[PDB]
C-alpha cells in the first residue's frame, strides 16, 4: 500500500529527506540516509510490531547474539556516521548494531546482530534524537556533585584532576602524587560517570613523572600555577612519548619565562593539549591562540567565552579581578578581539573541542547547551559554511558535535571504546527531545543501562507527573554503577596491576594513541591556518583576514528552557 | 518552510511512503461472530486468530494484514470486513501464536499441490474450533 | 508532620509557582517551568479546594494563555501531568493543551 | 491490688475486650486475647521494670536465648494471628516469641525464648500496632525512588522487573535476559527493600525461559506487549511447575488470539497469578474478572481503583488514552460496572491481593492507605460482613490485611520467612499509631534493625522536633543494609551459585512452594464463585447476584493526613 | 550564607506554611500538616523576632482554633515541638494541647 | 519541567529571599543569610527581567543598607556572587561591598 509522509512520521518519525529543527535554533538538520527499510518496522507496544514469534524472537538463547536492548526508529546525530535513521542494538554493554532490527523467522532485511529476542528490552527512539555523550577534558574535581549537572547536560566523561576544594585544585586539573592518586581513583568509584585523572607536570627528572604514571594518571597538566616553565613541557612531554600519555597545558600568562614562541619551541613538535586557547582563562597574553596554527596542537576553549556575547566583558574582567584576588594584567587577560576570534575558529574548524574548566572559570552543565548557542549565533552571523548543503545545517551541526564527543575522545586517547555511535564501541548515549536538544535530555545511558534521566512524582501512576527533575537510575546503583563506568589509567598502571593494588570495582581502561596524533586526525576540526594578533590591538587575523563577529543579544536554548 | 516550523518541528517532504509493494495480496471476508470486540495487528498470523472470527482460514496460511506495521483491524460484533492479507518474509517460520503451525509456512518448490504440513495445519485448525 | 516522599516533592511545586505567579504580574512572559509550574498548581489546589478531576482540568486549562507566555513554550507544553489529592483519594489530572 | 482499665491503659495500653479506632474510619478492632498476665508488665524507662536484675537479667550470655530486641505491650494485627496483646522478641534477625517478656528470676509466666537481658534493646509498643510489612507483587522498576514512598507507606518487598525508564518497563515488569537479571540484581543491592525479579515468559521452546530462571528470577511475567498468546503461557507454566516458580499475566485486552476462556483454557489448571484481575490495567475485555472463578487462580487487583470513587471514571479514561498515546478501545477498556464489582468482590474475599502497578497505573506508596479505604468504604455500603462479630470489625480488618500480606507472600512463594507476625519468620515489621493507621507508619523493622522513620531535626535535643519527615536509619546504611535485606531467587539460581557469579552481599533466598497452591490456600480470601459478565451493559452477576456499590465522595485517611 | 543542614531544613517549614496561611485566607480548613506547619513558624518567627520561649508558647498555643481545622486534627496534634534560635540560643519550645 | 541540578537548587534561595523581605518588612534587622538571600535574588530578578550584567551589580550593590542589617553582618558580606540566567546565557555577577 501507500502512505502519506505525514502519517508514517507520525507513526515512526522522519525518513530520508525530512527535516528537523534543533530547539528553537535556526538549525535543520536532515536524514541522510534510513537504513530500517519501509513496512517491518520494529515498535514496542501493546498490538504493535515486537510481539513473541513475530517482530520478536522466541525461539533463540542469547548466545546466539541476540540483543539486550534496541533502540527503535532514532535519528542519529554522530560526527562519524552523520544524519540517520536506524535501529540501534546493544548487547554486552556495547553497540553491536545500527540497521534494521527484527526477527529473521518473519521478515526480510534484518540486520545480522540486531535479532531481538527473549533477551531484549526496548526503547522507542521514534521522535528521538541519539547521540554519544560528551566529555569533558577540563574538569577540575573541586566538588563532586558535578558529575550530576553534567549528567543533566549529557556529558558522561570526565578528565581532570584534583583532590576537593584545595587552593590548587581552585586553579588547576592536577591529582599530585601516587598517594593522591590513589585516593582519588577510590573515591571516583563513587561518582556515575567514567574519569580519567590528570597528574602534575612541573618536574625536573623522569622520577616524579614515572611515579604518578604507575599510579594510574592519564595525562600531566602543566600550569603556571605550578610553573608553566621550558623545564616543565619538555620533561612532560618527554615522558608522555614513554608512557602513552597526554600532556594538557596552562600556559605562561605573565610572560615570565617567555612568549607564546618560546612555549611553542618546548613543545618540540610533540603532541600537546592546549587548555583555553583564546587565553581568557589563562596563556601568554595577548597571543596565545597562534598555537591554533600548529599541527602537533589539539586545542581547546573552556565553555564561558562561547557563545561571544553583550555581558560577556563585564563578566569576565570581574570574574579575574576575584579568581584571582586582584588592572593591567586585566585588561591584557581580557580582550574582545581575542574572544570574538575564538568564536569564528571554532567555525571554521580551527579550535577543535569544547571543555568546561568546572568551577574554575566555566560551567559542567553547560558544553552541550553552549555548543549549540554557538552554532545558531555564528548561523546567524556568517550563513552557511560553505560546505553545507543548501537545505541543511548537517555540516555545521556535525562540526560542533565533533567537539563534546569525539574530538576530546581522540585527544585522551579513548576513541577505541568511547565518543561515537558506532560498532564496538561503549554503549555512552544520549537520548534527546528535538524541541530540547543540547539542553535537557530525556536519558543517559552509561554502559548499556539507564543511570540518569528525568523523571517526576515516584508515587505516581506514570513516569510523566509532575514534578519532572533529573534523578538517578538503576544503572546509578549498587555494584552496578561501578561495573557500567571506566576509570581510565595508563599501561603502565594497567600493567603493575592498578586495579588489584588501589582496589578498584570499576572497569580500568588503558588509554592508548594519544602521542601519534595530529590536529589532522580530528574529525571535522581539522583546520591549521596562519593565526596574527596584533600586540597592540589585539585583533586577530586567520590567513590575512580580520576575525571576528558582533555579541549576542539573545540566546538560544536559554531563558525559554531554564529556571537556573 | 523554516520560517514557521514550531520548536523541534519536522519539516517533511511531500513523495508519500510505498511498503510493502512486491508482496502478493489475498482478500478475505472476515465476520465476528462472537459477542465481544476482535482486534487484529500488522504482524499476527492471520490463520490463528481468535476461534470466533469466521473466514476462509486456509486462505490466511502465512499470512498478515497487508497494513502499517505496528497498526491494527478492529471486528466489531456481527459485522463483516474484507481484509488484504500478504505473506510473511523472512524464513516464513512461525513458531507460538496458538501452536497451529509451529513451522514453515512456505509454499515450497510444487506450483498447483499444498504442502502436507499445510493441509494438517488446516485439519488441525478446524477440530481446535477455529471457524471456517 | 510526618512528610512522606511525596509530600515533600510537592514542595518544590509551590515555591516555582509563587516566583512565576510574581513574575507573571510585573507582566513577564513566562518560560516552560514557570508556566508548568502555574498550571500544574492550579489542578493541586483545585483538588483541595474539593472540585472534581473533570473541573479542576477545564480550570487548569485556562490559567495561561499564548499572550502569558514566550514565543514557542506552547510547542514545549503540549499537555501537564500531575497528581493531586481529591477528596475521594489520589488521582491523576491531565491537562490537554494547557496555552491555548 | 484493683486498678481501673482507664488507668491501666494509660499504663500499658489496651487489654482484652478493649475496642482501637483505626484512624478516622468507622472500623474498631477488638482485643482478643492478652498474652502478657497482670501486674509483671515490662516497660522500658527510669524507674521502671526493665532495669538489672528486676525485668531484666543481668547474669545470662547471649547464647542462652537472650533477646536482641524486644517490642512491648503491643497489638498485634496480623491475618494468621489475629488481634493480641501480647510482647515481641527478636533474635538473630528473626521473630522468636510472641507472648509475656522478662527475667525468670523475679517473675512468673516468661515466655520461653523471651529473656531480656544484657543484650537486649527495647521498643515500647504500649500505644502501638504492630503489622507485618507489607508486599508489593506488580512493581515496575522504572525509578529506584519508589522504594521510599513504599518503606513509607509500610511496604518492604518488591517483586517486579524492569531495567530503569525503557518503553518496555514503562509498560511490564520484565527484566528480560541474564545480562539484564544480572544487572538488575547488582543494582538492588543499593535498595532497602527485598526484592525479586521476574522474567519474559513470551518464549516457544524451553531454552529461552530456562536461561533466566539461572540467571536468578522468580518468576516469569506474560504480557500483551510482549505477546500474551497461548504458547507463551503454556510453555511459561510447564517451566514454571519445573522451577518451582511464579507465573504472572496480563492477558490480551484486544481478544486477538482469544476470549478469556481460552486464555483460561491455556492455563490448563497451572497455578498462575492475575494482575489487574478487573480489567481496567489490562485484560480481556469486558470479562477477565471471570479469572477469579478458578482454584488454580491466585487473583490481584491494582491500587487505582480501589476504593471505587467518584473521579474514578474521568482519571482512568483520560489515563490511557495517554497511557496508550491514543475510543472504543477506551470506553470498553473503563467499566464502571466492572470496577465496582472489583470493590465487592474483595471484600467477599474472591480477590485475593492489593498491588499497585508503580508508575504504570498505579501507586507505590498507597497500597496499605487504600486497603483502609476499601474497608471501611464498603463498611458503610454493605455493613458487617456475615463472619463479623457484632462488636467489631476484626473479621474485616483481617481480610483485607491479607490482601498486603500473607496473600502475597503465598503468592511468589515466600511466606516460609515473610508475611505474617509468627515465630520463625524474618522480622519485616511495622509499627503504627492507630490515629495514623495505614497512611503514616512510625517505622519500619527490615531484619531486625529499623531502616525508615519518621525523624525531626536531627540537631534538636530530641527526636521529635519539626520537621518530622521520613529518612533512613541505620539498617539502611553501610554493609547493614544490604545484610538486612534478601534478594529472592529460583531455587535453580541458588544452586548454580548466583550469589558469587553474581557477586551479591544481600540475603540470597530461594523461592519455594509456588506449583501447589491454589486459591483456598490463600488466607481470609479463598472464595470460588460463579462470576457472569453482561457482554453489553458489563453488569456482573456473583453466584447469580449483581455485584455493585455506589461510589464515595470521601476517602478516610486522606486529605486529613495528607499535604502530597 | 554557609546553610548548614539545621538552617536547609527549616525551609520546608517555611514553604509548608506559607500554603498554609494562603488555604485559611480562603476559608480552607487545614489538615494535620498545614496546622503543624503554621504553629511551628508561629514559634520561629517569634524567636526571631526576640521574645522569650515563655511568650512564644502562649503565641503559637492561640494561632489556631477548632473552627479553623479539619474535625479530628486536634487529635492528631496533642502538641507540637520546634526548636528555635533565640537571643540566648537554640531552644525547644514545646507548645501544648496547641488546638483549642 | 525537566529540572536540572541547577535549577533545583536556586529554589532554595527563592525561599530563604522570600522569608526575608519579610522580615524587613517588619522592621526586623537581618541577618548574615537573610541579607545574602536578599541581593543574591536581585540579581536573579534582575536578569530575567533581561538587564545586563553592569546593570543588575547596580541594582544589587544598593537594595540593602547598614541600618537594615545587624551591626556587623557588613564584615560578613564583603561580596556576593551568583549566577544568574541572563538573556545571552549564563552569567557570574559580583556584586562588590553590597552593605553601604
Ligand atoms: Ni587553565
Ligand atoms: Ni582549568
Ligand atoms: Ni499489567
Ligand atoms: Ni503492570
Same mark, same amino acid.
Given at each position: 500500500?501507500?502512505?502519506?509522509?505525514?502519517?508514517?512520521?507520525?507513526?515512526?518519525?522522519?525518513?530520508?529527506?525530512?527535516?528537523?529543527?534543533?530547539?528553537?535554533?535556526?538549525?535543520?538538520?536532515?536524514?541522510?540516509?534510513?537504513?530500517?527499510?519501509?513496512?517491518?518496522?520494529?515498535?514496542?507496544?501493546?498490538?504493535?510490531?515486537?510481539?513473541?514469534?513475530?517482530?520478536?524472537?522466541?525461539?533463540?538463547?542469547?548466545?546466539?547474539?541476540?540483543?539486550?536492548?534496541?533502540?527503535?526508529?532514532?535519528?542519529?546525530?554522530?560526527?562519524?556516521?552523520?544524519?540517520?535513521?536506524?535501529?540501534?542494538?546493544?548487547?554486552?554493554?556495547?553497540?553491536?548494531?545500527?540497521?534494521?532490527?527484527?526477527?529473521?523467522?518473519?521478515?526480510?532485511?534484518?540486520?545480522?546482530?540486531?535479532?531481538?529476542?527473549?533477551?531484549?528490552?526496548?526503547?522507542?527512539?521514534?521522535?528521538?534524537?541519539?547521540?554519544?555523550?560528551?566529555?569533558?577534558?577540563?574538569?577540575?574535581?573541586?566538588?563532586?556533585?558535578?558529575?550530576?549537572?553534567?549528567?543533566?547536560?549529557?556529558?558522561?566523561?570526565?578528565?581532570?584532576?584534583?583532590?576537593?576544594?584545595?587552593?590548587?585544585?581552585?586553579?588547576?586539573?592536577?591529582?599530585?602524587?601516587?598517594?593522591?592518586?590513589?585516593?582519588?581513583?577510590?573515591?571516583?568509584?563513587?561518582?556515575?560517570?567514567?574519569?580519567?585523572?590528570?597528574?602534575?607536570?612541573?618536574?625536573?627528572?623522569?622520577?616524579?613523572?614515572?611515579?604518578?604514571?604507575?599510579?594510574?594518571?592519564?595525562?600531566?597538566?602543566?600550569?603556571?600555577?605550578?610553573?608553566?616553565?621550558?623545564?616543565?613541557?619538555?620533561?612532560?612531554?618527554?615522558?608522555?612519548?614513554?608512557?602513552?600519555?597526554?600532556?594538557?597545558?596552562?600556559?605562561?600568562?605573565?610572560?615570565?619565562?617567555?612568549?607564546?614562541?618560546?612555549?611553542?619551541?618546548?613543545?618540540?613538535?610533540?603532541?600537546?593539549?592546549?587548555?583555553?586557547?583564546?587565553?581568557?582563562?589563562?596563556?601568554?597574553?595577548?597571543?596565545?591562540?597562534?598555537?591554533?596554527?600548529? %599541527?602537533?596542537?589539539?586545542?581547546?576553549?573552556?565553555?564561558?567565552?562561547?557563545?561571544?556575547?553583550?555581558?560577556?566583558?563585564?563578566?569576565?574582567?570581574?570574574?579575574?579581578?576575584?579568581?584571582?584576588?586582584?588592572?593591567?594584567?586585566? +585588561?591584557?587577560?581580557?580582550?574582545?578581539?581575542?574572544?570574538?576570534?575564538?568564536?569564528?575558529?571554532?567555525?571554521?574548524?580551527?579550535?577543535?573541542?569544547?571543555?568546561?574548566?568546572?568551577?574554575?572559570?566555566?560551567?559542567?552543565?553547560?558544553?552541550?547547551?553552549?555548543?549549540?548557542?554557538?552554532?545558531?549565533?555564528?548561523?546567524?552571523?556568517?550563513?552557511?559554511?560553505?560546505?553545507? /548543503?543548501?537545505?541543511?545545517?548537517?555540516?555545521?551541526?556535525?562540526?560542533?558535535?565533533?567537539? &563534546?564527543?569525539?574530538?576530546?575522545?581522540?585527544?585522551?586517547?579513548?576513541?577505541?571504546?568511547?565518543?561515537?555511535?558506532?560498532?564496538? =564501541?561503549?554503549?555512552?548515549?544520549?537520548?534527546?527531545?528535538?524541541?530540547?536538544?543540547?539542553?535537557?535530555?530525556?536519558?543517559? &545511558? =552509561?554502559?548499556?543501562?539507564?543511570?540518569?534521566?528525568?523523571?517526576?512524582?515516584?508515587?505516581?501512576?506514570?513516569?510523566? %507527573?509532575?514534578?519532572?527533575?533529573?534523578?538517578?537510575?538503576?544503572? /546509578?546503583?549498587?555494584?552496578?554503577?561501578?561495573?557500567?563506568?571506566?576509570?581510565?589509567?595508563?599501561?603502565?598502571?594497567?600493567?603493575?596491576?592498578?586495579?588489584?593494588?588501589?582496589?578498584?570495582?570499576?572497569?580500568?581502561?588503558?588509554?592508548?594513541?594519544?602521542?601519534?596524533?595530529?590536529?589532522?586526525?580530528?574529525?571535522?576540526?581539522?583546520?591549521?591556518?596562519?593565526?596574527?594578533?596584533?600586540? +597592540?590591538?589585539?585583533?586577530?587575523?586567520?590567513?590575512?583576514?580580520?576575525?571576528?563577529?558582533? %555579541?549576542?543579544?539573545?540566546?538560544?536554548?536559554?531563558?525559554?528552557?531554564?529556571?537556573? | 518552510?523554516?520560517?514557521?516550523?514550531?520548536?523541534?518541528?519536522?519539516?517533511?517532504?511531500?513523495?508519500?511512503?510505498?511498503?510493502?509493494?512486491?508482496?502478493?495480496?489475498?482478500?478475505?471476508?472476515?465476520?465476528?461472530?462472537?459477542?465481544?470486540?476482535?482486534?487484529?495487528?500488522?504482524?499476527?498470523?492471520?490463520?490463528?486468530?481468535?476461534?470466533?472470527?469466521?473466514?476462509?482460514?486456509?486462505?490466511?496460511?502465512?499470512?498478515?494484514?497487508?497494513?502499517?506495521?505496528?497498526?491494527?483491524?478492529?471486528?466489531?460484533?456481527?459485522?463483516?470486513?474484507?481484509?488484504?492479507?500478504?505473506?510473511?518474509?523472512?524464513?516464513?517460520?512461525?513458531?507460538?501464536?496458538?501452536?497451529?503451525?509451529?513451522?514453515?509456512?512456505?509454499?515450497?518448490?510444487?506450483?498447483?499441490?499444498?504442502?502436507?504440513?499445510?493441509?494438517?495445519?488446516?485439519?488441525?485448525?478446524?477440530?481446535?474450533?477455529?471457524?471456517? | !508532620?510526618?512528610?512522606?516522599?511525596?509530600?515533600?516533592?510537592?514542595? !518544590?511545586?509551590?515555591?516555582?509557582?509563587?516566583?512565576?505567579?510574581?513574575?507573571?504580574?510585573?507582566?513577564?512572559?513566562?518560560?516552560?517551568?514557570?508556566?508548568?509550574?502555574?498550571?500544574?498548581?492550579?489542578?493541586?489546589?483545585?483538588?483541595?479546594?474539593?472540585?472534581?478531576?473533570?473541573?479542576? !482540568?477545564?480550570?487548569?486549562?485556562?490559567?495561561?494563555? #499564548?499572550?502569558?507566555? !514566550?514565543?514557542?513554550?506552547?510547542?514545549?507544553?503540549?499537555?501537564?501531568?500531575?497528581?493531586?489529592?481529591?477528596?475521594?483519594?489520589?488521582?491523576?489530572?491531565?491537562?490537554?493543551?494547557?496555552? #491555548?
Amino acid at each position: 500500500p501507500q502512505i502519506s509522509r505525514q502519517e508514517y512520521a507520525g507513526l515512526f518519525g522522519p525518513t530520508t529527506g525530512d527535516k528537523i529543527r534543533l530547539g528553537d535554533t535556526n538549525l535543520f538538520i536532515e536524514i541522510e540516509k534510513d537504513l530500517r527499510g519501509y513496512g517491518e518496522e520494529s515498535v514496542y507496544g501493546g498490538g504493535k510490531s515486537l510481539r513473541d514469534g513475530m517482530g520478536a524472537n522466541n525461539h533463540l538463547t542469547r548466545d546466539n547474539g541476540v540483543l539486550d536492548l534496541v533502540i527503535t526508529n532514532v535519528t542519529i546525530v554522530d560526527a562519524r556516521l552523520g544524519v540517520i535513521k536506524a535501529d540501534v542494538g546493544i548487547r554486552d554493554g556495547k553497540i553491536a548494531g545500527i540497521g534494521k532490527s527484527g526477527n529473521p523467522g518473519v521478515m526480510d532485511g534484518v540486520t545480522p546482530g540486531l535479532v531481538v529476542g527473549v533477551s531484549t528490552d526496548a526503547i522507542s527512539g521514534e521522535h528521538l534524537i541519539l547521540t554519544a555523550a560528551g566529555i569533558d577534558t577540563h574538569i577540575h574535581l573541586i566538588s563532586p556533585q558535578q558529575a550530576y549537572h553534567a549528567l543533566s547536560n549529557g556529558v558522561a566523561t570526565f578528565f581532570g584532576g584534583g583532590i576537593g576544594p584545595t587552593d590548587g585544585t581552585n586553579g588547576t586539573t592536577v591529582t599530585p602524587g601516587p598517594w593522591n592518586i590513589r585516593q582519588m581513583l577510590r573515591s571516583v568509584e563513587g561518582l556515575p560517570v567514567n574519569v580519567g585523572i590528570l597528574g602534575k607536570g612541573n618536574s625536573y627528572g623522569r622520577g616524579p613523572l614515572l611515579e604518578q604514571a604507575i599510579a594510574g594518571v592519564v595525562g600531566y597538566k602543566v600550569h603556571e600555577d605550578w610553573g608553566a616553565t621550558a623545564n616543565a613541557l619538555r620533561h612532560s612531554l618527554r615522558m608522555a612519548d614513554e608512557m602513552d600519555i597526554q600532556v594538557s597545558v596552562h600556559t605562561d600568562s605573565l610572560n615570565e619565562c617567555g612568549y607564546v614562541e618560546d612555549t611553542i619551541d618546548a613543545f618540540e613538535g610533540r603532541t600537546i593539549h592546549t587548555f583555553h586557547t583564546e587565553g581568557a582563562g589563562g596563556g601568554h597574553a595577548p597571543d596565545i591562540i597562534r598555537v591554533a596554527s600548529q %599541527p602537533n596542537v589539539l586545542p581547546s576553549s573552556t565553555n564561558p567565552t562561547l557563545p561571544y556575547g553583550v555581558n560577556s566583558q563585564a563578566e569576565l574582567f570581574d570574574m579575574i579581578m576575584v579568581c584571582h584576588n586582584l588592572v593591567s594584567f586585566a +585588561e591584557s587577560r581580557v580582550r574582545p578581539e581575542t574572544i570574538a576570534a575564538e568564536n569564528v575558529l571554532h567555525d571554521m574548524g580551527v579550535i577543535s573541542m569544547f571543555s568546561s574548566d568546572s568551577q574554575a572559570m566555566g560551567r559542567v552543565g553547560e558544553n552541550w547547551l553552549r555548543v549549540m548557542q554557538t552554532a545558531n549565533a555564528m548561523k546567524a552571523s556568517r550563513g552557511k559554511l560553505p560546505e553545507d /548543503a543548501p537545505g541543511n545545517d548537517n555540516f555545521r551541526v556535525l562540526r560542533y558535535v565533533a567537539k &563534546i564527543t569525539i574530538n576530546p575522545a581522540i585527544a585522551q586517547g579513548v576513541s577505541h571504546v568511547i565518543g561515537s555511535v558506532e560498532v564496538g =564501541k561503549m554503549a555512552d548515549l544520549v537520548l534527546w527531545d528535538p524541541r530540547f536538544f543540547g539542553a535537557k535530555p530525556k536519558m543517559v &545511558i =552509561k554502559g548499556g543501562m539507564i543511570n540518569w534521566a528525568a523523571m517526576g512524582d515516584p508515587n505516581a501512576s506514570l513516569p510523566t %507527573p509532575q514534578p519532572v527533575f533529573y534523578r538517578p537510575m538503576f544503572g /546509578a546503583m549498587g555494584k552496578t554503577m561501578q561495573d557500567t563506568c571506566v576509570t581510565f589509567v595508563s599501561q603502565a598502571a594497567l600493567d603493575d596491576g592498578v586495579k588489584e593494588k588501589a582496589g578498584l570495582d570499576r572497569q580500568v581502561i588503558a588509554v592508548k594513541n594519544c602521542r601519534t596524533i595530529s590536529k589532522h586526525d580530528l574529525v571535522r576540526n581539522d583546520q591549521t591556518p596562519n593565526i596574527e594578533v596584533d600586540p +597592540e590591538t589585539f585583533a586577530v587575523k586567520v590567513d590575512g583576514v580580520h576575525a571576528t563577529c558582533e %555579541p549576542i543579544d539573545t540566546a538560544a536554548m536559554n531563558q525559554r528552557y531554564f529556571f537556573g | 518552510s523554516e520560517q514557521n516550523t514550531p520548536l523541534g518541528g519536522c519539516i517533511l517532504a511531500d513523495t508519500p511512503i510505498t511498503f510493502n509493494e512486491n508482496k502478493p495480496v489475498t482478500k478475505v471476508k472476515v465476520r465476528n461472530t462472537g459477542d465481544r470486540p476482535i482486534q487484529v495487528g500488522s504482524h499476527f498470523h492471520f490463520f490463528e486468530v481468535n476461534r470466533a472470527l469466521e473466514f476462509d482460514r486456509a486462505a490466511a496460511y502465512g499470512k498478515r494484514l497487508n497494513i502499517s506495521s505496528t497498526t491494527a483491524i478492529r471486528f466489531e460484533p456481527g459485522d463483516e470486513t474484507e481484509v488484504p492479507l500478504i505473506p510473511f518474509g523472512g524464513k516464513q517460520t512461525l513458531y507460538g501464536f496458538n501452536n497451529l503451525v509451529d513451522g514453515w509456512t512456505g509454499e515450497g518448490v510444487v506450483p498447483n499441490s499444498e504442502r502436507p504440513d499445510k493441509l494438517e495445519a488446516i485439519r488441525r485448525a478446524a477440530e481446535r474450533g477455529f471457524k471456517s | !508532620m510526618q512528610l512522606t516522599p511525596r509530600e515533600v516533592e510537592k514542595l !518544590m511545586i509551590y515555591t516555582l509557582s509563587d516566583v512565576a505567579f510574581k513574575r507573571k504580574a510585573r507582566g513577564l512572559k513566562l518560560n516552560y517551568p514557570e508556566a508548568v509550574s502555574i498550571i500544574t498548581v492550579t489542578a493541586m489546589e483545585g483538588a483541595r479546594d474539593g472540585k472534581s478531576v473533570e473541573d479542576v !482540568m477545564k480550570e487548569a486549562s485556562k490559567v495561561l494563555t #499564548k499572550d502569558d507566555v !514566550m514565543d514557542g513554550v506552547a510547542d514545549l507544553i503540549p499537555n501537564v501531568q500531575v497528581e493531586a489529592i481529591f477528596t475521594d483519594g489520589s488521582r491523576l489530572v491531565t491537562v490537554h493543551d494547557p496555552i #491555548k
